[PDB]
């Protein structure tokens, strides 16, 4: 009954950006306001999760177990034999399909492959997976994707999308989601995973520049 | 369906997509979803016109958008819509929830594409929109619904109602989904079909 | 589903200055085929109406529209036109909307004054669907939709229009369990109507 | 919804949030929930019958003279939750509430909507008889801000209508103003 | 679906249609509804038969003689009753049984008989078999009788049609007498017999 | 929606790349038809997760086959039987060349080899047109009074490409779930050729 | 349950079962499921218990009222039209008549036999041979095989014999035989030696 | 459906219907609904499609296993006890045998005929005459009237003829006659001229 | 409940049991299940007959003739069909009808016949009547036949019993031939006939 | 129920009402709802699994040494709402809540039960970090008294357990004491 809603992401010319709000809603009650739903799994991967928070914590536990077990008897676990975004995604999809006693979540695994390819995939409680230049989960799949898809309508738009353009698009999508989503919060976390700069994880970001003045006329 | 209304500095503009669907099947690719209630009152959704005209003749006055709203909501309550127009009291933009409740708005969206259109409206709507800016904004919201929603497609219909002048209805304002030419012509040679009987009908 | 009890399909297409309307002849009680002579196309002068759906409702509406168009012709001293008849059909379906008829009508005809083709359909929402190319109705509407959408091309000559519509109907009927047992095609011109029976699978 | 009517020294202040939701989606975030059913009688809900009640109250005003707030509550009851607030020189500012059961309760202050549940203790501990306009406004601001903070289906700007012998004064407060409280 | 099998002086005639439907949509008009379990066993359905064929191959390897029709039908009926809307005939010939037809259905029944029709069109096939069936039919007469019996059901039953696949089970194994399109067959039968008078054409 | 057509020494398996949930587009390019090597192309549509599981298990099975038979090219009939025994709310179609070098399309247990087969949401829109245009159903030689049927000639891979493109263009026009791009995989003696064609994105 | 009709060159032959079953036992094995609407029109009817006879007597009363009022025998085509109107109106009434009817008549003005099948929804259809409910599932194949528009009354009676034998052989219930009535230019008669 | 049994002075007479009906059509009209459990014991069974024959063959296998194991023909009383145990256990299992049986035997040690009626619940009862399902609703009134413990096999056959005629007269469905078998000191035999 | 009426050369014999039950509780063993509508009409049930009797009085006042059995049965059948689990026989005599029995049931059915049995025990009453009924029964034989049929139903049917009430409808009206306790009648019948041999005693 | 755990300057105070109800009937009006699952770890259901958790925690204390409050919450979670409050000199006072979803949330203060709904706004405005013992006790008294005043299924005496390095101190407050607050 405790759930989180929003996870949105898009890939750009040099990596992936992913953000989510820090809220846990107990039905209609905005009960918990500090929940973190972006789970870095390395300098190259972030796992954003939505839905049941208990299953979100379970998935976080599994991801930390992955990072632990990969280092066993593996001297190259640090640089060359480190976990890829794809290995994490396939492990998580296998977990979801095994439980599916399904895990009541939807997960976007975002990152950059060791060869530099942007990884961005979706998986949910049914085991349905897909990739796209922009991904969103829950209520964001309806409001956020139209906004993000104006920036990258197709694959060929990715190389023409700069860091700042995608960043401002994601921020605007969070502002719109806060406008129109009842189970959303003003506070969100954002993670940039650039192929050059690596994971750049921002926390406690603020939805700003909201417009309310036109209410006085109505 | 995707319907948006956008109030601008001197009037109101409503737009819609032209796709009608029978479940997953597109029955009509060019359905007109903007309907006149009176010359300057139009509606769109996801008797009233005739009664409005009769009352306009009876009272010898231009219809109020509030009159159409009141009659339509009372009709639905007895047994979603956007009704927008201009009347002597200015330009108006109302929405009706078919169970009876109504609200005022400066920009609205309805239909399955309502969320995709509302994203664009929230992102780009501002006070003191000019006519051209408002038409562009409504068209962009409808296009967002078209591209992102499976129930919306084909073309954009726009109706612009400005206070000082008559309403201009822009049937198929944009046509972004025109079909490409087929690779081959599938013309059968005459005599391909086997016929049992041929007769002339006395119409 | 009352419309699926008896099955059957109707398709109307527009040619160059001429119209075609076609239907299958099967009447059945679900799986059981009862009659191969239940024509679903009626004419009320120079305007043709194909009605699919529940067969009792087809007969009832045929009787009702014969009554209404006979009175119209007597009062007006002119035959009803395809557009006026489309409006009449739309209003008659509405008058029973609560407890509706389980039918999908297809109007086809040539307006006698302008002399140009007209075809129209009516959807579940009751919206008139007036189409420049083709109207399909019945159980095989999906099969017909794809078939017509691939075969149809603008400005078909009557002899090519016959072949196109007959192939569309035959190949859609072959893939519909509840449709078949023969087909009839009307080619409607300014001056004459030619009725043809098609050879087809009798299973 | 989160509506709140409070009688105070000079009259009655009726206030409400501006969010309306259809599920998780915010259908309208700037809705005006305060309904003027008669000159000095304003009501809230937690629309068709509001028009019917306005009709019946105009008919009553024509036949029998100006209705009181009790009159409006009675009309609602015979047509039927609702908070009916009003002002007149004889009864001063009045608050009536008509919960879902259909009973009519005259109260010093009333709270309704899903947001009201979260502020029962706050309003109980903070209400005082015959507050000033400033004190009443601050009280409503704090109560509605907490109701908005906790209730997902409540939010947006806070609107208030102040009813007094002087006239009808409409106030609006933005999230930048009350969320910092 | 319509499947019929009947025994006569010349062995067994197995006739089936070919249609498959998903509701009203005709998914296919060339489905094979007879499985050739052995050169002497035909399974008619209206995984199971793959299992039965595997068991028959094992029996052929283990035992000196071929699996009997009774044994195969009993295997299938036991398996079906374990998982207890389907009907099958196990048609075959054994030197110590003669021509034998066993009807098996999803309820677990198992019936030895001379004539069986199964599927939505079964009543229409019965109408023709019962009135035209004789034990002493020639092979040509019996093949025509099966073809005509499936044609009747295909005409009157909406979910039956496509084409008629004729099989003949003789002392030397089953013979596949080919596929007949019901579209061509209906008309050919109508001219040669003069039946189906109500049908225009 | 997927579509397999067998022809003269070629087979094609085509499908739209759109992925949807309810009335929302998940992705516009999610490949649906897979070149499985050994000159076999496959697609498991239907419920996505069960299709993925079936494809994964079939890849495991073919890897074991290669192990036991020393990397022998898996024949289309062997693959079809394997796919049966593995069989999920899935409608699988596999296409390739049979041991005689003829195009072969297998549709799925209860596998059926057929000259052509459509599957998915818009199978009903596509298949009748292909019956008419490939199998020449309901077509007769002109002037024969419906006595002589139009002979079933074979179509070259060019003509089949045209037919597939037009069928999917029509399905895109009239089916809301169909069409962001068209993925066509041609299987021939040379190998597997992949073509992509754009479709309307509304 | 069993209501069969066959139109031959000169007459219409209607056969109907004799049994009446209420729950656990057969109450009657000589019931006549036909009403003479007119000197040359005959209506067989089948369906749920009370509705059949109620509807049949109501139709007979109205048809006789028309005949007396107009001093004219309504044609079978007009009688079937009236019956179809009554069924189609009741199907969307508070309590429908769940009745299926075969109307066999001899049109004296056209000098032709006519047979109409009307189901409880009001689905009228003019047929060469008819059968309501499951009875058609067995008899239609035989009739398609053997029916000829030119048969004489004797050949039509033989074909009905074949159909009734098939129904007795394959249909599970015991309908206790059939009553066969012939509608002809000479009026209505009943075949006893059937 | 129809399973009747009558114990007379010297023999047990079991009658069972010949028809097998699945859904819309009668699949067979010569079905034998009896299994010989022993040279002097016979079991008739009725019930839903697949359970009856499965249960009958399982019982036959177990009874023959006992007989071979002990080189001794189990008495009808012991056979009916075994059948009752199997039915009573299965009814509170995951899949009951929803089967009713009449067990008619001649006890060679006691030189008396015995008839036992057992329902799917496991309700065994030793009867002078028996009938399962609705068949007893018609026959019991005739048997109560005419049954005598002293009847000869001919009189018992005549009383079975009376009962079967009553069932044919009043019971709606057609059960295609009965197969009648007599269990006697000489073994089991079928009455063909019934 | 068990009621039977049959026609013979001597008129109509109407026999009914007396038991009424509420579940397994036997509320009464002396319920009168025959309504004496007129001196010539008997209603048998297994408010309505109050209405019918009032209508018959009104009819006999309006017209010279007595209400026919057909008319009374159709009054009751229309009434029941208007409110459409019950079964009644309308039994009577009219000079221009003769002895007549009309069976009416809750479903709106209305049947003229020679023999009818209604109620939970109807199958046993049929088993006795069908096998012992003749048209040329003496009045004594017919009365005994009705008594014996109700006795059979009462013995075998749990919800039938109490006592047998015999009515006889002659040309001059109906005759009440008394009430017979099934307890005494059962034994009397057992000794005189020698039937019910399975019953100890 | 109306349970409330609050960390403060010296430790954690866990408090609850004493009313239990089956429908409108008060089955027990003096129940002790604070459950000691380990020496300095107390929980509060909002009984059998409490025994199981105590069993597992004793087993843990024997094997691996003294469990933490997080250990107790983990054991609840793996067996499974709960408020788990405890104290140790390494972590000081801790509060964990395990709402019906099954997720575990470490909090400065927690409120649960049906009565918690009515005091969300009050506790939000009145809570302060690192209050004194007296201040924390007064805060809990006022919060629980309002929850009791509004929640029909909450009432009776207010019980508190004060966990600190000094020891475990139990407190009781009667309606004559807190209803007048």
Strand partners for F104: F96
**Contact call for C147 and F138, based on CB within 8 A:** no
CB of F34 closer than 8 Å to CB of F42 = yes
CA B154/CA B20 separation, integer angstroms: 10
Q: Number of helices and strands (H, E) in chain H? A: 4, 12
- Output the domain CATH number for residue I201: 3.60.20.10
- The verdict on a CB contact (< 8 Å) between J117 and D117 is yes
Here the tokens at position J95 are 């509060």
Question: How close does chain G come to E125, measured CA to CA in Å?
Answer: 8
Q: Is B197 on the interface with E (CB under 8 A)?
A: yes
C-beta separation of E14 from E43 below 8 A: no
Q: What is the largest CA-CA distance in chain C?
A: 47
Residue H88 near residue H119 (C-beta atoms within 8 A): no
In terms of residue numbers, what domain contains F51?
1-202
Which sequence positions of J are flagged as catalytic?
Answer: 1
Mutant choice from I2, I118, I131, I156 vs H, greatest count of H C-beta within 10 A: I131
Token pair for E11: 């062995």
Helical H segments across A47-162, by residue range: 53-70, 85-99, 140-149
CB E118 within 8 A of CB E111: no
H-run or E-run covering H51 = helix H49-70
The domain total for chain E is 1
At B167, which helix (H) or strand (E)? none
Domain span at residue I141 reads 1-201
- Residues J76-110 as b/e (b if ≥16 CB within 10 A, e otherwise) read bbeeebbbbbbbbeeebbbbbbbbebbbbbbbbbb
The whole-angstrom separation of Cα J74 and Cα J103 is 10
CATH number of B3-174: 3.60.20.10
H94 has a chain E CB within 8 A of its CB: no
H185 touches chain E (CB under 8 A): no
Give the position of tokens 């091309």. C153
To the nearest whole Å, the CA of B74 is away from the closest chain D CA by 7
End-to-end C-alpha distance for chain E, whole angstroms: 26
Name chain A contacts of B116, Cβ cutoff 8 Å.
Answer: 142-143, 145-146
Contact F24 A132 (CB under 8 A): no
Distance (Å) from the alpha carbon of C77 to chain G's nearest alpha carbon? 29
3-state DSSP helix/strand/coil percent for chain B, to nearest 5? 25, 35, 35
Q: Are D172 and D158 in contact (CB under 8 A)?
A: yes
CB contact under 8 A, E24 and C177: yes
How far is it, in rounded angstroms, from Cα G2 to Cα B135? Answer: 69
Mapping DSSP onto H, E and C, the string for A163-200 reads HHHHHHHHHHHHHHHHHHECCCCCEEEEEEEECCCEEE
Q: Are I137 and I10 in contact (CB under 8 A)?
A: yes
Known catalytic membership, residue B21 = no
Given resolution (angstroms): 2.7
Distance of alpha carbon B152 from alpha carbon B120, whole angstroms: 15
Q: Between I122-132 and H136-146, two packed helices, what is the crossing angle to 10 degrees? A: 50
Alpha carbon distance A80, B145 (integer Å) = 45
* CA-to-CA dists, residue C114 to C83, C109, C190, angstroms: 12, 12, 10
Contact between residue F191 and residue B170 where contact means Cβ atoms under 8 Å apart: no
Write the CB contacts of C21 (distance below 8 Å, at least 6 apart in sequence): C10, C11, C12, C13, C41, C48, C50, C106, C108, C119, C185, C186, C188
Structure tokens at F100: 């005689």
Please state, in angstroms and rounded to a whole number, the distance separating the CA atoms of residues A207 and B9: 28
Q: Which of C203, C176, C200 is nearest to E151 (CA)?
A: C203
Q: Smallest Cα–Cα separation from H46: which of H153, H114, H120, H112?
A: H120
Handedness of CA E44, E48, E54, E58 (dihedral sign): negative
Residues of E in contact with B197 (CB under 8 A): 200
Question: Can you give the CATH number for the domain in which F121 is found?
Answer: 3.60.20.10
Q: Is the dihedral of CA D53, D57, D58, D59 positive or negative?
A: positive
Contacts 24+ apart (CB under 8 A), J46-50: J46/J1, J46/J3, J46/J81, J46/J82, J46/J83, J46/J112, J46/J113, J46/J116, J49/J76, J49/J79, J49/J80
Token code pair at residue A67 = 């990072």
Is there a contact between C158 and C192 (Cβ–Cβ < 8 Å)? no
Q: Beta strands H112-118 and H99-107: pairing type?
A: antiparallel
Q: Pick from F178, F175, F153: which is nearest to F17 by CA?
A: F178
**Burial group, residue E140, by CB count within 10 angstroms (0-12, 13-18, 19+):** exposed
CA distances from I67 to G58, G61, I72, I92, J67 (A): 22, 21, 7, 10, 98
Nearest to I106 by CA among I90, I91, I85, I126: I85
CB count in 10 Å sphere of residue A208: 9
CA dist., res. A60 & res. A92, Å (int)? 10
Three-state SS across chain E? Answer: CCEEEEEECCEEEEEECCCEEECCEEEECCCCCEEECCCCEEEEECCHHHHHHHHHHHHHHHCCCCCCHHHHHHHHHHHHHHCCCCEEEEEEEECCCEEEEEEEECCCCEEEECEEEECCCHHHHHHHHHHHCCCCCCHHHHHHHHHHHHHHHHHHECCCCCEEEEEEEECCEEEEEEEEEHHHHHHHHHHHHCCCCCCCC
CB contact under 8 Å between F124 and E47, yes or no, is no
Indicate the helix (H) or strand (E) that contains A153: none
What's the distance, Cα to Cα, between the start and end of chain H in Å? 19
The separation between CA F98 and the C-alpha centre of its own chain, rounded to angstroms, equals 15
Apex F53 CA angle, F48 and F55, nearest 5: 95
Number of other CB atoms surrounding residue C93 within 10 Å: 17
**3 state SS of I190:** helix
* F53:A97 CB<8 A: yes
Cα distance between residue C20 and residue E183, in whole Å: 26
The helix (H) or strand (E) run that includes residue G162 is helix G153-170
Return the residue matching tokens 């009819």: I59
**Number of CB pairs, chain B paired with chain D, less than 8 A apart:** 18
- Per-domain boundaries in chain H: 1-194
Query: Rounded to a whole number, what is the distance in Å from the CA of F163 to chain E's nearest CA?
Result: 20
Distance separating alpha carbons of residues B112 and B101, to the nearest angstrom: 19
Looking only at the bridges linking them, the beta strands covering G99-107 and G41-47 are antiparallel
Q: Which residues of E touch B196 (CB under 8 A)?
A: 200-201
Pair D28, D37: CB distance under 8 Å: no
CA distance readout (Å), F141 to C150, C151, F147, H9: 22, 19, 8, 83
Cα gap D55→D70, rounded to integer Å: 16
Q: Which residues are CB-contacts of H22 (< 8 A; sequence separation ≥ 6)?
A: E87, E105, E107, E109, H49
Domains of chain B, residue spans:
3-174
- The DSSP symbol for G123 reads -
> Alpha-carbon distance F190 to E155, whole Å?
46
At F68, list the tokens: 């036991």
Q: Do H22 and E122 touch (CB under 8 A)?
A: no
Question: Can chain F be said to touch chain B, i.e. do they have 3 or more Cβ pairs within 8 angstroms?
Answer: yes
Q: Are residues A177 and A140 in contact, defined by beta-carbon separation less than 8 angstroms?
A: yes
Tally of CB atoms within 10 A around F4 = 31
Cα distance between residue A45 and residue C140, in whole Å? 50
A140/E134 Cα distance (integer angstroms): 72
- What is the C-alpha to C-alpha distance for residues J121 and D145, in angstroms, rounded to an integer? 9
* Listed residue (H125, H71, H121) closest to H103, CA to CA: H125
Residue of E130, E146, E149 lying closest to E138 (CA atoms): E146
Q: Which of A1, A32, A57 shows the shortest C-beta gap to J100?
A: A1
β-bridge pairing F181-187 and F116-119: unpaired
Reported residue count of chain G is: 194
Interface test with F, best of A10, A127, A134 (most F CBs within 10 A): A127
Q: How many domains does chain F contain in total?
A: 1
- Which residue stretches of chain F are H helix? 48-69, 76-86, 123-130, 157-174
Q: Do B197 and C46 touch (CB under 8 A)?
A: no
A185 interaction partners in chain D (CB closer than 8 Å): none
**Separation in Å, CA F116 to CA C168, E166, F39, F157, J136:** 19, 24, 18, 14, 78
Three-state secondary structure of chain D = CCEEEEECCCEEEEEECCCEEECCEEEECCCCCCEEEECCEEEEECCHHHHHHHHHHHHHHHHHCCCCHHHHHHHHHHHCCEEEEECCCCCCCEEEEECCCCCCEEECEEEECHHHHHHHHHHHHHCCCCCCHHHHHHHHHHHHHHHHHHECCCCCCEEEEEEECCEEEEEEECHHHHCCC
Experimental method: cryo-EM
* Two structure tokens written together for C77: 């001293």
Report how far residue G150's alpha carbon sits from residue G154's, in angstroms, rounded to the nearest whole number: 11
Tell if the CB–CB gap between A215 and D114 is shorter than 8 Å.
Answer: no
Do you know the residue count of chain E? 201
Angle at G24 between CA G21 and CA G28, to 5 degrees: 30
Query: Helix-strand-coil percent breakdown of chain C, rounded to 5?
Result: 35, 30, 35
Chains interfacing with J (3 or more CB pairs < 8 Å):
A, D
Structural domains of chain D ordered from first start: 3-179 (3.60.20.10)
Burial class (CB in 10 A: 0-12, 13-18, 19+), D25: middle
Sketch the domain layout of chain A as residue ranges: 1-218
């Amino acid at each position: 009954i405790v759930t989180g809603t929003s996870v949105i992401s898009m890939k750009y010319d040099n990596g992936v950006i992913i953000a989510a709000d820090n809220l846990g809603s107990y039905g209609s009650l905005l009960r918990f306001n500090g929940v973190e739903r972006l789970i870095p799994v390395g300098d190259n991967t972030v796992v954003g999760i939505s839905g049941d928070i208990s299953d979100m914590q379970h998935i976080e536990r599994l991801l930390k177990d992955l990072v632990t077990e990969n280092a066993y008897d593996n001297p190259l676990a640090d640089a060359e034999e480190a976990l890829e975004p794809s290995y994490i995604f396939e492990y998580l999809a296998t977990v979801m399909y095994q439980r599916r006693n399904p895990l009541w979540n939807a997960i976007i695994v975002a990152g950059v492959q060791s060869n530099g390819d942007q990884f961005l995939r979706y998986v949910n409680l049914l085991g349905v997976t897909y990739s796209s230049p922009t991904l969103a989960t829950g209520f964001g799949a309806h409001m956020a994707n139209p906004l993000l898809r104006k920036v990258v309508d197709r694959e060929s738009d990715i190389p023409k999308t700069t860091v700042q353009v995608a960043e401002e698009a994601i921020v605007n999508a969070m502002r719109v989601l806060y406008y129109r989503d009842a189970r959303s919060s003003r506070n969100f976390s954002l993670a940039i995973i650039d192929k050059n700069t690596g994971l750049t994880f921002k926390k406690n970001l603020q939805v700003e520049n909201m417009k309310w003045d036109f209410a006085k006329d109505i | 369906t995707t319907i948006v209304g956008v109030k601008f500095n001197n009037g109101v503009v409503i737009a819609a997509d032209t796709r009608s669907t029978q479940g997953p099947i597109v029955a009509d690719k060019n359905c007109a979803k903007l309907h006149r209630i009176s010359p300057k009152i139009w509606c769109a959704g996801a008797l009233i016109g005739s009664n409005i005209e009769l009352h306009s003749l009876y009272t010898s006055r231009e219809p109020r958008v509030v009159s159409a709203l009141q009659m339509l909501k009372q009709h639905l309550f007895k047994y979603y819509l956007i009704v927008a127009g201009v009347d002597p009291t200015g330009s108006h933009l109302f929405s009706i929830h078919a169970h009876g409740s109504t609200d005022v708005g400066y920009y609205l969206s309805l239909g399955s594409g309502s969320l995709a259109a509302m994203a664009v409206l929230e992102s780009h709507w501002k006070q003191d929109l000019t006519k051209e800016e408002a038409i562009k904004l409504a068209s962009d919201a409808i296009q967002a619904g078209i591209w992102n929603d499976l129930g919306s497609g084909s073309n954009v219909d726009v109706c612009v109602m400005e206070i000082g002048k008559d309403a201009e209805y822009l049937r198929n304002y944009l046509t972004p989904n025109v079909r490409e030419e087929k690779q081959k012509s599938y013309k059968f040679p005459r005599g391909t079909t086997a016929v049992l009987k041929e007769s002339i009908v006395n119409i | 589903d009352p419309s699926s009890i008896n099955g059957g399909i109707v398709v109307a297409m527009t040619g160059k200055d001429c119209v075609a309307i076609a239907c299958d002849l099967r009447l059945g009680s679900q799986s059981l085929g009862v009659s191969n002579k239940f024509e679903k196309i009626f004419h009320y002068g120079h305007v043709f109406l194909g009605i699919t759906g529940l067969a009792t409702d087809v007969t009832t509406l045929n009787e009702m529209f014969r009554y209404k168009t006979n009175l119209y012709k007597l009062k007006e001293e002119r035959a009803i036109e395809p557009e006026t008849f489309t409006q009449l059909v739309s209003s008659s379906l509405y008058e029973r909307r609560f407890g509706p008829y389980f039918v999908g009508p297809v109007v086809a005809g040539i307006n006698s004054k302008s002399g140009k083709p007209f075809i129209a359909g009516f959807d579940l929402i009751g919206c008139i669907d007036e189409a420049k190319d083709f109207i399909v109705s019945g159980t095989a509407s999906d099969q017909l939709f794809g078939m017509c959408e691939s075969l149809y091309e603008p400005n078909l000559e009557p002899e090519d229009l016959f072949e196109t519509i007959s192939q569309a109907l035959l190949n859609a009927a072959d893939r519909d369990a509840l449709s078949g047992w023969g087909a009839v095609v009307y080619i409607i011109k300014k001056d004459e109507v030619v009725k043809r029976y098609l050879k087809m699978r009798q299973d | 919804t989160s509506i709140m009517a409070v009688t105070f020294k000079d009259g009655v202040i009726l206030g409400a949030d501006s969010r309306t939701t259809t599920g998780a989606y915010i259908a309208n975030r700037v809705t005006d929930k305060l309904t003027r059913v008669h000159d000095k009688i304003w009501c809230c809900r937690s629309q068709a019958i509001a028009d019917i009640v306005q009709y019946h109250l105009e008919l009553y005003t024509s036949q029998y003279g100006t209705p009181s707030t009790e009159t409006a509550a009675s009309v609602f009851k015979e047509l039927c939750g609702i908070i009916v607030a009003g002002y007149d020189d004889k009864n001063k500012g009045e608050v009536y509430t008509i919960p879902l059961g259909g009973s009519v309760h005259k109260l010093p202050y009333a709270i309704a909507g899903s947001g009201s549940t979260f502020i029962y203790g706050y309003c109980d501990k903070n209400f005082r008889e015959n507050m000033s306009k400033e004190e009443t406004v601050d009280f409503i601001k704090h109560s509605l801000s907490q109701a908005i903070k906790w209730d997902g289906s409540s939010g947006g700007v806070i609107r208030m209508v102040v009813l007094t012998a002087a006239g009808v004064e409409r106030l609006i407060f933005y999230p930048d103003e009350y969320e910092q409280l | 679906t319509t499947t019929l099998a009947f025994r006569f002086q010349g062995g067994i005639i197995v006739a089936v249609d070919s249609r498959a439907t998903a509701g009203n949509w005709v998914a296919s008009q060339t489905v094979k509804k007879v499985i050739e379990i052995n050169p002497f066993l035909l399974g008619t359905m209206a995984f199971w038969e793959t299992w039965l064929g595997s068991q028959c191959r094992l029996h052929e390897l283990r035992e000196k003689e071929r699996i009997s029709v009774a044994a195969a039908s009993k295997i299938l009926s036991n398996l079906v009753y374990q998982y207890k809307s389907m009907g099958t005939m196990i048609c075959g010939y054994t030197r110590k049984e003669g021509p034998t037809i066993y009807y098996v259905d999803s309820d677990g029944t198992r019936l030895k008989g001379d004539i069986f029709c199964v599927g939505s069109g079964q009543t229409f096939a019965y109408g023709v078999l019962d009135s035209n069936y004789k034990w002493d039919l020639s092979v040509e007469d019996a093949l025509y009788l099966g073809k005509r019996s499936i044609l009747a059901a295909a005409h009157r039953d909406a979910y039956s049609g496509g084409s008629v696949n004729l099989y003949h089970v003789t002392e030397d194994g089953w013979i596949y007498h080919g596929n007949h399109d019901v579209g061509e067959l209906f008309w050919k039968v109508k001219e040669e017999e003069g039946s189906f008078n109500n049908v225009i054409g | 929606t997927i579509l397999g057509i067998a022809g003269e020494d070629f087979a094609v398996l085509a499908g739209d790349t759109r992925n949807i949930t309810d009335y929302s587009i998940n992705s516009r390019y999610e490949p649906k038809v897979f070149d499985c090597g050994d000159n076999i192309v496959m697609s498991a549509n239907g419920f996505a997760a069960d299709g993925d599981a079936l494809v994964k298990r079939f890849k495991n099975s073919v890897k074991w086959y290669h192990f036991d038979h020393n990397d022998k090219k898996l024949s289309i009939n062997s693959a079809a039987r394997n796919i049966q025994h593995l069989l999920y709310y899935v409608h699988t179609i596999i296409a390739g060349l049979d041991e005689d070098g003829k195009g072969a399309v297998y549709s799925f247990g209860s596998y059926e080899r057929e000259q052509c087969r459509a599957g998915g949401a818009a199978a009903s829109l596509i298949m009748p047109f292909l019956d008419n245009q490939v199998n020449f159903k309901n077509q007769y030689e002109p002037g024969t009074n419906g006595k002589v049927k139009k002979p079933l000639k074979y179509l070259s891979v060019e003509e089949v490409i045209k037919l597939v493109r037009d069928s999917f263009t029509s399905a895109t026009e009239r089916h809301i779930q169909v069409g962001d791009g068209l993925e066509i995989l041609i299987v021939t003696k040379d190998g597997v050729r992949k073509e992509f064609y754009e479709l309307k994105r509304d | 349950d069993i209501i069969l009709g066959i139109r031959v060159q000169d007459s219409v032959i209607l056969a109907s079962s004799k049994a009446v079953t209420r729950g656990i036992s057969v109450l009657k094995d000589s019931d006549d499921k036909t009403r003479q609407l007119s000197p040359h029109t005959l209506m067989s009817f089948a369906g749920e218990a009370g509705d059949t006879v109620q509807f049949a007597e109501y139709i007979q009363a109205n048809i006789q009222l028309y005949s007396i009022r107009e001093d004219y025998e309504l044609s079978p085509q007009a009688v079937s039209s009236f019956v179809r109107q009554e069924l189609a109106k009741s199907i969307r009434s508070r309590r429908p008549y769940q009745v299926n009817v075969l109307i066999g008549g001899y049109d004296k003005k056209k000098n032709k036999p006519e047979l109409y099948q009307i189901d409880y929804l009001g689905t009228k259809v003019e047929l060469p041979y008819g059968a309501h409910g499951y009875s058609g599932f067995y008899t239609f194949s035989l009739l398609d095989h053997h029916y000829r528009p030119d048969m004489t009354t004797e050949e039509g009676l033989d074909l009905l014999k074949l159909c009734v034998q098939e129904l007795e052989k394959r249909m599970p219930m015991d309908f206790k035989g059939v009553i066969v009535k012939i509608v002809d230019k000479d009026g209505i008669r009943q075949v006893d030696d059937f």
